[PDB]
Structure 1
Amino acid sequence: KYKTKVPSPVVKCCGATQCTSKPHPDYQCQVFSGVYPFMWGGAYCFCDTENTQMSEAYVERSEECSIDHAKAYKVHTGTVQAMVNITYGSVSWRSADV
């Protein structure tokens, strides 16, 4: 099972921001313009109706992958072995794998 990790988004108050192509599995990046966010204790800043929020995200494997996971195998025909129990005459049972 996967776990998606979101980093902290950057907020440009009045300007523009761009992101590169970071090496990550299923990396996503975007730019949303004109958000005007409202945090606690008032608005974030003053530059009205044009802003920039990045809000990138990428995926990774979870911490439960080390406990339960599915292993993929490709088979090929190999050895056959068996264990026999034998006796003869007055000699008692002795076992060895063949």
Structure 2
Amino acid sequence: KFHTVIPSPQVKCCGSLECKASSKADYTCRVFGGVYPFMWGGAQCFCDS
């Protein structure tokens, strides 16, 4: 069985966060440009869209 670990997501606001290749087993990376994350404590960054 594989473990399929998902790392903690990285967010950059009013900025671009393209990702490089990795040597991990079946490394799938994807960039999303319209997010607005919410932890326990409200919005996680300043930039609106």
Q: What TM-score, normalized to structure 2?
A: 0.83
Aligned residue identity for 1:48? D
Stretches of 4+ moved more than 3 A in 1?
none
Consecutive unaligned residues in structure 2, runs of 5 or more:
none
1:2 corresponds to:
2
Q: If each structure's strand is expressed as a fraction of its own residues, which one has the higher value?
A: 1
User: Matches of 1:46 and 1:3 in 2, distance apart?
Assistant: 34
Higher helix share: 1
What is the match of residue 19 of structure 1? 19
Structure 2 distance, partners of 1:34, 1:5, is: 24
Question: Could you say which residue in structure 1 is the equivalent of 2:44?
Answer: 44
Task: Note the alpha carbon deviations across 1:41-76, whole angstroms, 9 max, x for none.
Answer: 121122111xxxxxxxxxxxxxxxxxxxxxxxxxxx
Q: Percent identity among equivalent residues?
A: 61
TM-score under structure 1 length normalisation: 0.46
